[PDB]
Every structure is written in structure tokens, then in C-alpha cells.
Design a protein around this ligand. Structure first.
Ligand SMILES: Cc1ncc(C[n+]2csc(CCOP(=O)(O)OP(=O)(O)O)c2C)c(N)n1
Ligand SMILES: Cc1ncc(C[n+]2csc(CCOP(=O)(O)OP(=O)(O)O)c2C)c(N)n1
Ligand SMILES: Cc1ncc(C[n+]2csc(CCOP(=O)(O)OP(=O)(O)O)c2C)c(N)n1
Ligand code: NA
Ligand code: NA
Ligand code: NA
Lengths: 527, 531, 527
């Protein structure tokens, strides 16, 4: 058996039968041995490749294989790889390397220190020391990617290694499983449940790891038992809670003073499956309101260690929430009132207000749509206006690395055969991942992409107000036709400027067997 | 005192002092405080994508020779530029890349848009990288960054600055920083010359192999004079990124093949290989055999000590390529050989197919294009065609990505053109390559940069079909890129584009494009040999 | 309140009141603010300091603070720090750095990239970006060091930072706790207990994490229930099991072929709290014997991912073993017979055979002595001849980094007020940590150090036989008088070459209230 034959038998064994790639000189020898039950998904650009892989991974929860070209290809993906770290995405990224004997002379398409290139992002990286060790290195890469705290891994393989004889002890590799402890001490539970039934006025703050661990329902049950309001942790990348449940209050602001002012009056903040906290704008003050204690539950030891306040429990979010939800006593307090009806959304301007666009999307879109959002200035509008209740209904770049949305939408859709993925991309964001449109065309991936085109980097105009920087060079991106870009990559696109035309183009796009792009002209509030 | 200056005011006074008045950027939360203090004599060039930004900066740098400033956003923006940065390393391009970082007190908690270990992110590419330990040290860190970028062996440097540092009071002793110069020894021992000239006048049949650093050091003329004096054939070192010699000079023989056995077979018969301004060697395809032909000794002259150390054969001299070549050219004795005959006429260029053969397209480009065009090439399968068919005779006439990192060509062309007020830049980009830097077309449109971009569209990754023959890998997934309209992409970014499939229509579209005051794209349908 | 005042209030809060150090220019400002309830332990050499800290940490289980000097001081400790990684030792190593404004100009005693210097060893390293962040960086360092998988952390602090005003939000830091899930799913248990009661002829292989988690008793109960033989995993750094219990069989050989041949006949290898496996000598072949499946239980996800065979469970070793021990059914199989008598130990030679010296040590030493071993060629002798029956009775350098033994003995003794620590150091090993004798003298630490002096690097003569390298330069270390070295550092020393004189010197040394060193002349088998 060759290193290639054993590696492929192993990827199949682990469910990595979808490969996202942009190929090169040094990866043809890997790709040549590829079996017929595997599918290769080509992207024209490594950032798109990797972000497509990321979206595919987020929807499935499964590890996902990426194959990139040398240093130039791996480098082009570093920006996207940041999002994978904070989204706890088990991408397994393999890179082709030049013939093993020639790397030292730095011949053309040598990756010099391949283990260093992708640090400090990836949890783990290896250039195996010999062809023999390539299969076990890939086994270790996969187990490592799926180990709490989940995350991306990188393996650089010299192209001549694939042809080498595989080591005898490789039937051994296939058989390997690695399990995580899926709970925490019985003693440590009774402390959590005492503190919860103790609290006079508690609040749940929920992060992406609740959505990742498919614990939306157990979060709901725990909010019902405590009659507790529920906020989403700041800078959210996923939606961990039904947005029209009585307990839902929205997203905490990502300012230190602003977040503590919002939670004023609560004696216990229980934060589940989020860092404490993913602040953004620098607005200094108190982490907590007076007379408040914070309990913190996370898969990520890094998150628990680096928090500046609180009592953390490092444990699986799924299990913990399931246990607490099924064992806390219903409280005395009255069940919470139903939420106000959705605020009314008028539009005065040449185009649509984001608030109105999202209300039109709510009315038109399937009950079980998946929304891949990368529309930086429209957050307040989205949350005040969307009705999400399925697991896995919202994805946003977890480190605000732009060029996630368009590609992640395509990848999410490929993973989601019976759920409609709708991309809501700004005109700025779309340019970082535009070539993923070609992949949707080629592989007939029926995504809907909505470009919110306000002619500007809106969120950066928002910041030049808070930072008193004023009229800075390069806030404006005028003169982009996204219909021309879509047709350039073989995707059918229409431009739209009124509610009636949008409702039409959207109803149409949801019916389509093919990728569709709608360019909406949107208005930016210049206060 | 009332002579109180901010870190921003001193940094800007310094960038002006050093000629870095052109800034390439894609902005973010953490860079607005830098950009806000930017003066009026400075120009910001926005790119929609950091790889495009940085490749534009690279092109601008290659034409001028000067250090060039880039400003990127945090970890996500810096990471998007790692691919492009590889080309900067092998092209010895003095890019100074600054990145915004989150407020200094908040980086440890890893708040949103924290770069965690900013110094590690860009290793091992950049020669040098710093996150200064305080606001006070930001000006000197940037001074050091610039001197370091321009120091043999030239290359890219990275500085991550927390955004709150710009507003901090600058250190007292900063008039001192401006006054700073750093000079490199621009020559080598008199004794060491007489060894070079003895070995050269010794050789019964010597050959010059020339690399990018001859073009970088503006030594094209002195290389010519040296080839005239030795009546020596001149080859370009393999996997060239620049053209260091006139391609229609008597001595010109073309590009050495980038295989070990193939290169040594080509130089068979020569007793002295003098390699100037190149690694030994930038091989690509693994074709094993002898590094040198029988009876041959290799002299190797390079600014780069790394290149001299890592070479697997040869006697190297680490010295400035410019000076060395100037000295040798002016002091070697005319040899007892006949001056070399003029080159044959250009081979004839017929095209059988639905489109143009690259050899015919390049012959049409030769006939249409000004004497002094600059060509930015990123067309991987068309190399033999280019060299057999182009008449390059001026410094700085050819750029190709120095680590074959694709997404250099389109953006580097735009940047090269911005730097090149009196010379037409012509991009020759494949349909594959163009997608890695497509957004640089927007920058050309916005800033009214009169580049001509020729997409050679053969519907495929041609050079990878070339490789699946040599590597016996066969029908591999993802060799084909069908269903892309570059005219639609150009018009999408506000560049005027036409598609063309015959010599008559190409000659027309090209004559027109060269007259334009605006970026123009010609999509040529080309033929790929499947037999 | 200054960064120094808050840092000290925090170290006290966390029980880090014992500080091991070698001081310099850049650490005086930290040390000056040290309170009276704290003790500083000076070592003359950073390797010794850090190995002393390691020994102190191993006996207590607690995180332990080290303070080193700049790049030259930190560099001198890199070797010792390797042992801390593989011994899962929560050392918190702080280093002084030059004044923050002057680091860039690389003035004298600048650490250039302090975060890079100690990678890839330490789990985690920071140079805080400002004085304000120094207390939280140290809080994060501590939590990180104690988080499964435990290990060393490094923090470089510019000396001017200690004097800076501390941030408002510092009462917050003190209050912080981080707990680990101290168990694993009820479902995942029933799989373990089925597989164990299933097996016709199972074997326990035990590693250092059993001793670290104070699970010696529960390992015993589980071996009694399965009437199972117990081996220690190869290259052991701790003793996880009573050596005179019926089930005890010794240490597995650290060769691939040799280990699988030893376990031939077993259908289930359960490995608890060790890597799979810590091989040394390259003796190639089959990882497992035919018809064998390996279950692997570890706190370390790194250990579980990189293993080349086995079904791994990443979980707390203490809990797991306690659960299994209390819930597996007693088996049909006959209770195991009492062990063979200790083999006879005669000596023909100018000195003692190691086997005879260890039998003299067995007879003379308290039931509950702690042995710190760094005697590379004497392993077979130690295990065939010692009666260890208590938690924390054996320590050996976990990456065979020499210069652990002498210092770890001193540190172990300082931590161990009512148990006698006995160091068994070779003449080779002793030179790497000799200066720790000074620390024992200064702080009146009643360690007993036995130098086994065979005039040679014995284990390297052992290897030049297996590697057919022959008479290699530098196998011999003649002309060293350890009595002169002891007295040089203010420790009482005697040299000894017969059983009768050893029994005398040893009886005397156990009576001492002061460090004592015995140099025994030993014989090396050149066969
Ligand atoms: C790779 C990368 N480059 C730059 C940024 C900075 N950035 C964040 S918000 C923003 C504006 C994006 O514009 P658009 O998508 O149009 O959103 P809008 O604010 O207009 O709703 C930019 C450029 C980033 N986060 N990531
Ligand atoms: C960033 C990057 N990804 C992948 C490669 C591998 N590669 C080498 S040539 C090539 C095909 C591009 O060819 P194209 O521009 O279509 O020109 P042609 O081969 O048709 O002449 C690719 C993808 C690379 N060099 N750089
Ligand atoms: C820091 C370090 N350097 C070198 C070695 C290699 N080494 C391992 S065993 C050994 C010899 C030590 O001999 P000694 O302690 O006298 O014991 P003996 O072999 O005679 O039992 C050496 C040099 C090592 N393990 N650690
Ligand atoms: Na916008
Ligand atoms: Na092509
Ligand atoms: Na010895």
C-alpha cells in the first residue's frame, strides 16, 4: 500500500469525502489517487476555498478537508483561517510541498518553514519528518481538529511522499477513535444548580458554542424554568436561541460600559458558550454592573483562562445545558410576556433601509432558511427584524475577517440539501470572496446572495464617528456592478431598488435550481 | 515645552523624509486613527482586497526601486496578504507593511480584531517584524523597519501598531530620527577584482547567466558591455521575474530551463558559468542529474548572502551586483574571439485553432506596442512563446511573480503603471491568474490608471496540464476554469473591456487600448495544445 | 494600588507563596515589593532553580512560581523546562525584562521576542502589551498552567511595569476561579465497564498521571477486581502502583517489538495516564501483539491524538479510575499469587553493584521515603529491588533531560516536611544540577543525596552496544570527587565503597537535620 492509498482509506474512514481545493504543481500527485466516491470542490482563490470549507463545516459540525498550493496558496488563506479559529471550525488544511530533497535549496514553490507559516492561527501544524509518517500525521491532524477546543490544523506534504510505501502498522491507524468526556462531576452540578435557584433575578448570555452543540432547545428550557431574559453574547457569529421566544432581548452591545449598563439589575449573569467578552469598540468602564457575579461555561480553556472576571467551568456546553435544563426547579416568578410585534419599517430614500429589507426577507423566506450575514453596519436592523427558530440559522464571521460571507454561503448551501441558504453580504464584504460565485455556478449550488449595496464601507463611517477620525481616505466603494460580477462568473443576477421589485426578484430566486444574486440598493444613515 | 508632537505627527514627518508619500491600503476599525493624521501631499490608494493592495504596492516598488508603504487591517487583513508577500521576498522588494492593532490594554483579553502574536503571524516571510513595546517606540520602530527593508538583501518588513499609540506624546529625541541615513558598502576589495578578471580573461569559452538583481540595480548596460568584451553568450537564470538584458542583443540566448539535468545540458561546452544576480538555481520541475556540465566551474555574484550560502555548487562572492558588473565591464580586456553574429529574424507566427496561439499574440503585441513598454507577465504556460517573440531593450521591461504566487500580475500591472508616468504597462495575465487579483481592476478605474490588461483565456490552468504530463498524474480534478467572462468582470469594476479571437480584431482592440486615458481589458481567446 | 501590589495579592490568593529564583538587574523591582508571608528560594543556576521548583510542584500538586533573569537566565532553563512539559508540571515562570521604552534598541539584557524564546516548550507564553495588562496576564498564566493538560507557562514583564498604577477592575481578578469537568458521560462509562468485564485476559499499563491524580489506591482496587497484572508504562517518571502488590510485574521495555512481545497473550491492554507509548531505543515492528485491542485513558488530548494505535478517552484519570474501580464486577479468575522473594544481591568488584546498593537502601530507608532517581543505567536494578507503597514515592526526569534529579530532590524535600527524600543520581547526571546542593545548605533542607559513581556515562555505553558505534569519544567521566563538590557548597559528604560502610553512612545521613551526600563507588557491567 502507498501513503496515498492509506491516507484516502483514512479520510473515508473519518467522513472527509468532500475536498475543497485550488490546485498546483505540488498537489497533482495527491489529487491523482483520489477515489470516485470523493468530490473535489474547486475555488479560484484560496481564501474562497477555505471560507467555502468553513461554511460546509459549520452546517455539518464535521471535520472538513482543504487542499492548497505551497506557500503562495496557504498564505492567501491566512485571513480566512482567523475566522475558523474563533468559530471553532475543524478544518484540516493540507498543502502541497516541493520534492523533499530540494526544499533546502529553496527551489521555486518551496514553503520555507511550513510549520511556522500558519502559526499562530491553527491549533496544530506539521511537516512530517518522512513519507512514512504522513498517514499518522494526518490521523493526528484530524483528532486534534475535533478535540475540545475544536479548530483548524495544517499539514504540509512533499509531493513525492504520496508515492512512497506506507508503513506496516496502518490497519492500526484506521481503527483509532478519540472520545471527549461528555460531562462534569455530580458535585460540581449541585453548585451550578444551587447558584441558579439562589439568584433573585438571573440572566442567560448565550454564545455560538450553544448553536454548535445543537443545544438551542435546552437553552430554551432553562430560560423557561428560570423565567430568565436571554441575551446573545456580543459580536455573535451564530444564533443560539429562538429570536421570538418571550425570553429573547437581542445582542449585548460590544462595549465594556455599554454591556454592564444593559445588565444593570441582574445579580447573576450565566454566560454559556461564549468568551467573556468579545468587545469591539473601546468604551471603557466596569465589566459587570454593581452587585453582580458572572458564571461562565465553555469548551475552551483559553476562553476561561483569559477572561478578566468571573467563575468559569470548562465543560461541554451541550451536556452542561442539557443537565441544568432538566434538573433546575421551576421558579416562583411569572412566565415572561410575549415580545412586542415587529417594529414598522418605512423607507424614505433612493433605495431600501436595511430594517425594511430584512422585514421583506422575513416575509418571503422559508421558516428554515440559513442566513450567512457579512453586512457590518446593519446588525441592529437584522436582530430587530428576523424570526430565526431552527438550529444553524445564522453565521457571521467570528473574527470579522471579511471574505467569509459569500464563500461560506456557497459552502453552507452545498452542505444543506433541504434548507435554503440566503447570503446577506455588504458591497464591501462581497469583493473579498467574489470568486466563490464561480464555484456556485460550476457545481450548480442553489444559493441566494443578496448584496446590500450602500456605495460605502458603512461600519467604518460608524467608527469614524466613535473615534473622531472624520473624513478618512477609502470609506467609499462607488462604481461596482454586482450584476456584471455575477454574470462574469456565470451566476444570474438582478438589481433592485424598491420593496415591490425586491419581493418579486426574491420570490423568484428562492424557486431557482441555480445560484442567484440580487443587488439591493440600500440607504446609509450619515448621522 | 510647547514643541509637544504626537507619534502620528513624527511618523508622517518621517515617511515624507524617506519618500514614502504613496500609501496602499484596505482600511479598518484599527487604522482610522493612523489615516486621520495623513497630510495633503500624501496619496492613499485603496484596494478592495489586501492581496491586491500588497501586489499593487509590489509593482509600484519594482518600477521605482524605492521602499513603499502598505497599511492593512489587523490579523484578517494581514493574513489575506501572506500569499502576495511571498513574491516580495524572492523579488527583494522593500515593502514596509504596517497593520492596525486593537487598543494596547485590550489585546491580552483577545477582544474582536486583536492580532494575537502579531510578530509571529507574518514569519517566516518578512525579513523583520515588530509589535513595538510602547507608543513611544513607534517612530523608531518604523525608522528601523524602513532602513532594514532597503538593506542588502532587500525585502519586506511588518510593524503592528495599536491604534491608541498614534495619539500618544512622541519622545523628545525625534528630530534625531529624521537626520538618520544608513549606507551599504557599494563595492568589494581591489585584490578580489583581479581574481574575477583573471578568471574571466582566462576562460576559453565563458557564459554569463543573469538574474533579476541585474535589472533591479539598473546594470543592464554594464552587463551588455561585459558580454561585448568577452564575446560571451548571455542566458537569463531560470524562473526569471525580471529581464536583465536586451533580448535582441547578439549575446542573448534565452532563458535556462528550470530542471537540473536540462540546465547543465544547455551550458554543455562552457568552462566558466558566471552567474550574476540570481540564486544557483531557481529550479522548478524535479529533473535530476548533474548541476554543472563536465569541465565547468561556476562563479556566483549576489547581494543576497542567503543565496550564496544555500547554493549546492559554485564559488560565490557576496557583493553589490551594480558596482561589480560596472567594474568588470570597464576593466576586462577585449578577448581573442570574433564578435557574435546578429540573432536570426523572429520565427514566423501562423495560428490554426478557434483563437490565437500565444506565439502569434506576442508577435502582434511586439508589432503594436511601444519600444519601451513594461510587461507584467502572469501567464504560466506561454513562457517559451514570450521569449522567442518579444523585443525588450530598456531597464524594467519585464516582471513575473518571483515565487509563482498567482495574484501578482493584474495588481502589479496597476501599481507599475501608477509608478510609470512615461511608459505603457501591458499586463499579460492568464484566465486562471486573473481571478487571484481581479479586484485591482476597480483601483485602476477609480484612480484612472491607463494600464492595458490582456487576459490570455484558454479556458484552463494550462501549465498544470503541462505538469500532469511530466508528473504522470493524468486527469486531475480542477484543471479547467470554463464559464468566466472577463469583459463582464471588467465592466463590473468600471473598466472598459472587449473580447477578441482573431489577429485582425486583436490588432484593432490593442491599437485602441494603447491610445486610451483609462484602464482597458482585452480578453483574447487563446489555444492550448491538447496534442 | 500598583501592578506589584495587585500581583502579590493575587499570588497569595492562589497559594503561590513560595518563589524559586536567580535574580538580576531586571527582577529587583519585582522582588522589592515581596511580602513577609512569602519565602524566596535562591538557586545559583536557572536550570537548578527551575528543577527545584519542579520537584516542589510534583510533591504538592500545586502551581509554583519561578522568577528568572532576562534572555540569558530564561535560556539557561530551557532544558529543565522540557521535563516540566512531560511531567505535566504547572510551573509559572516569570522573567524580568528591560525598561519597556528601551527593548526595541536592544540595550544590554533585552529579551528580543520574549514570547518566541520559550516556544515551543511552555503551553503558553506572553509579554503583556502594557503594565495595565500584567496582573490579568499572570492570572491567565496560572489558570492555564492548572488546566488539563497541566504544564509550564512563561510571562516576561518589563521591570518598570511593577511601579505603574494598576487598572480599576482588579478586585474582579482575585475572585476568579476556573474548574475542569471532573468526570465523563454515563453512556461512555458503560462502554469501558463492558469492555473490561468482557476481556478474557486483560492487562493494566499505568502512567505518571495515576500518581499525579492520587489514584494509586483505585488502580489497586481495579487490579484486585480483574485479578489483572499491572505494568508501568515505559520511560516512567513516577510510580503509580505498589511494587510488592500481587499484580505488579514491573516496567514495560521502551522498544516497540520488545513491549508488544512482553504483552503477548493479552486481548485487552488498558493504558491509564501514559502516552502510547514513550519508546526510546529504536527496535522496530508491531505496536500491539496479535489479537489485542488497546484502550487509552488520558487528561492529555495531545497524547490521545498523536498515538499510532488505540481507542482513546480524554478524561480525568483520578475520576475515571475511581468510577471503574468501584463499579466493575469481581471476575471468576483466581486472586493472583504473592510475588517472588527479592532476588539475591551479592557484589564482586571494587565497589557495590546497583542491585545490592538498592537492597541496602530498601532495608535502611523509611517505608514512606520519596526517591528522586536520575541514574540512567540502573533501571532494571531499581525496580527488581525497591518496595514503594505510597503516593509520590518515585520521580524520574520525564524527558530524560539530565539536571532534574539533584535539584528536584532538594525541592521535593522542601515540600515534604515529614517524609525523607532520597536522591539516587549518577556521577554523570549530578554535574547538570550540582549547584542545588548550595540551596539545600542555605535553607537547611534535610535531603539525602546518593551519587552512584561508576566513573562513566553508563547508559551511553549500553547504547553504543545496541547501535554498534563502539569506543566513541567522551563516554568516560573520571576524576570527579563529589565529597569535595558537596563541601564546596556547604553540604556534609562521605565516600563509601563497601556494603558495611554504606549501611553506616546511610543510617547517619537519615538521622541528619541537614543535607548529606554519600558518594557510592558502583560497578558497570561492560557485557
Ligand atoms: C479582511 C478585512 N478587511 C477589512 C476589514 C475592515 N472592515 C470591517 S467593516 C468594513 C466595511 C464593509 O463594508 P460592507 O460589507 O459594505 O458593510 P456595511 O458597513 O456597508 O453594511 C470593513 C472594510 C475587515 N474586517 N476584514
Ligand atoms: C496562489 C497560487 N495558487 C495556485 C498556483 C498553481 N498554479 C500554477 S500555474 C496555475 C494555472 C494558472 O494558469 P493561467 O493563468 O490560466 O495560465 P495558463 O496556464 O493557461 O497559461 C496555477 C493555479 C499558484 N502558482 N499560485
Ligand atoms: C541534558 C542531557 N544531556 C545529555 C544527555 C545524554 N545522556 C543520557 S544518560 C547519560 C549518561 C549519564 O550517566 P550517569 O548519570 O553517570 O548514570 P549511569 O549511566 O552510569 O547509570 C547522558 C550523557 C541527557 N540525557 N540529558
Ligand atoms: Na456597504
Ligand atoms: Na489558462
Ligand atoms: Na555514570
Amino acid at each position: 500500500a502507498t501513503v496515498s492509498e492509506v491516507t484516502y482509506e483514512l479520510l473515508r474512514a473519518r467522513g472527509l469525502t468532500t475536498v475543497f481545493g485550488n490546485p498546483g504543481s505540488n498537489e497533482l500527485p495527491f489529487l491523482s489517487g483520489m477515489p470516485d466516491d470523493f468530490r473535489y470542490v474547486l475555488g479560484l482563490h484560496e481564501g474562497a476555498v477555505l471560507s467555502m470549507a468553513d461554511g460546509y463545516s459549520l452546517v455539518t459540525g464535521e471535520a472538513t478537508l482543504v487542499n492548497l498550493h505551497a506557500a503562495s496558496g496557504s498564505g492567501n488563506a491566512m485571513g480566512a483561517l482567523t475566522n475558523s479559529v474563533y468559530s471553532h471550525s475543524p478544518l484540516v488544511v493540507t498543502a502541497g510541498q516541493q520534492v523533499r530533497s530540494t526544499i533546502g535549496q529553496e527551489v521555486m514553490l518551496s514553503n520555507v518553514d511550513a510549520g511556522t507559516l500558519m502559526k499562530p492561527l491553527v491549533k496544530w501544524s506539521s511537516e512530517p519528518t518522512c513519507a512514512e509518517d504522513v498517514p499518522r500525521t494526518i490521523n493526528q491532524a484530524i483528532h486534534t481538529a475535533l478535540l475540545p477546543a475544536k479548530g483548524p490544523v495544517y499539514v504540509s506534504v512533499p509531493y513525492d511522499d504520496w508515492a512512497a510505501e506506507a508503513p506496516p502498522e496502518s490497519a492500526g491507524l484506521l481503527a483509532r477513535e478519540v472520545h471527549s468526556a461528555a460531562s462534569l462531576s455530580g458535585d460540581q452540578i449541585n453548585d451550578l444548580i444551587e447558584t441558579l435557584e439562589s439568584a433573585t433575578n438571573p440572566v442567560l448570555v448565550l454564545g455560538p458554542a450553544v448553536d454548535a452543540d445543537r443545544a438551542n432547545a435546552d437553552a430554551v428550557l432553562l430560560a423557561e424554568k428560570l423565567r430568565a431574559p436571554v441575551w446573545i453574547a456580543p459580536s455573535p457569529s451564530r444564533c443560539p436561541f429562538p429570536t421570538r421566544h418571550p425570553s429573547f432581548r437581542g445582542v449585548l452591545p460590544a462595549g465594556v460600559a455599554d454591556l454592564s449598563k444593559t445588565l444593570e439589575g441582574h445579580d447573576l449573569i450565566l454566560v454559556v458558550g461564549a468568551p467573556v467578552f468579545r468587545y469591539h469598540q473601546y468604551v471603557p468602564g466596569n465589566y459587570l454592573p454593581g452587585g453582580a457575579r458572572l458564571i461562565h461555561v465553555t469548551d475552551d480553556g483559553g476562553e476561561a483562562a483569559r477572561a478578566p472576571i468571573g467563575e468559569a467551568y470548562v465543560a461541554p456546553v451541550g451536556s452542561t445545558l442539557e443537565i441544568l435544563a432538566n434538573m433546575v426547579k421551576p421558579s416562583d416568578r411569572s412566565p415572561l410576556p410575549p415580545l412586542g410585534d415587529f417594529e414598522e419599517a418605512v423607507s424614505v430614500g433612493a433605495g431600501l433601509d436595511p430594517a425594511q429589507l430584512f422585514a421583506l426577507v422575513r416575509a418571503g423566506a422559508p421558516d428554515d432558511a440559513i442566513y450567512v450575514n457579512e453586512s457590518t453596519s446593519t446588525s441592529d436592523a437584522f436582530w430587530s427584524q428576523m424570526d430565526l427558530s431552527h438550529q444553524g440559522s445564522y453565521y457571521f464571521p467570528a473574527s470579522g475577517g471579511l471574505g467569509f460571507g459569500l464563500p461560506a454561503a456557497v459552502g453552507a448551501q452545498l452542505a444543506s440539501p433541504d434548507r435554503q441558504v440566503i447570503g446577506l453580504i455588504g458591497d464591501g464584504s462581497a469583493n473579498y470572496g467574489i470568486t466563490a460565485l464561480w464555484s456556485a455556478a460550476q457545481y450548480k449550488i442553489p444559493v441566494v446572495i443578496i448584496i446590500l449595496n450602500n456605495g460605502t464601507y458603512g461600519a467604518l463611517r460608524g467608527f469614524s464617528k466613535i473615534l473622531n477620525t472624520g473624513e478618512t481616505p477609502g470609506l467609499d466603494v462607488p462604481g461596482i456592478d454586482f450584476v456584471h460580477l455575477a454574470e462574469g462568473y456565470g451566476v444570474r443576477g438582478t438589481a433592485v431598488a424598491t420593496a415591490e421589485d425586491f419581493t418579486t426578484a426574491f420570490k423568484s430566486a428562492l424557486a431557482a435550481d441555480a445560484p442567484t444574486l440580487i443587488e439591493v440598493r440600500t440607504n446609509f444613515d450619515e448621522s
